[PDB]
Amino acid sequence: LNRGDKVRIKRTESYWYGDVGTVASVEKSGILYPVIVRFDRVNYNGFSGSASGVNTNNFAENELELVQ
């Protein structure tokens, strides 16, 4: 989409399936998953005992619904 412009993830395999994420950037370079979506909730990531996970993941345009 565009920077800002919060979307809801429709990718079923993701941690954030049904969560609202903000689009960080779109890499229009022929990428399979060009949309960087930034979240306010970190996922299950990292070795055991880690205090936080990652909040960024790449998505395709078909996996996102505009909600903003």
Partner 1 sequence: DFANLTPCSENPAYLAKSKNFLNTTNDPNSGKIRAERYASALCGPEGYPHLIVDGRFTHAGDFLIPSILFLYIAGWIGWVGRSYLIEIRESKNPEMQEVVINVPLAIKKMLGGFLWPLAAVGEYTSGKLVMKDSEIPTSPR
The angle formed by the CA atoms of residues 43, 30 and 35, to the nearest 5 degrees, is: 30
- Contact flag: residue 6 with partner 1 (CB under 8 A): no
- Contact flag: residue 15 with partner 1 (CB under 8 A): yes
Closest approach, Cβ 39 to partner 1, in A, equals: 10
Report the alpha-carbon distance of residue 62 to residue 33 in Å, rounded. Answer: 10
Residues 26-65 as x/- pattern, contact with partner 1 by CB under 8 A: ---------------x------------------------
Report the alpha-carbon distance of residue 3 to residue 35 in Å, rounded. Answer: 10
Report the alpha-carbon distance of residue 30 to residue 48 in Å, rounded. Answer: 36
- Site residues, partner 1 (CB under 8 A): 8, 12-19, 41
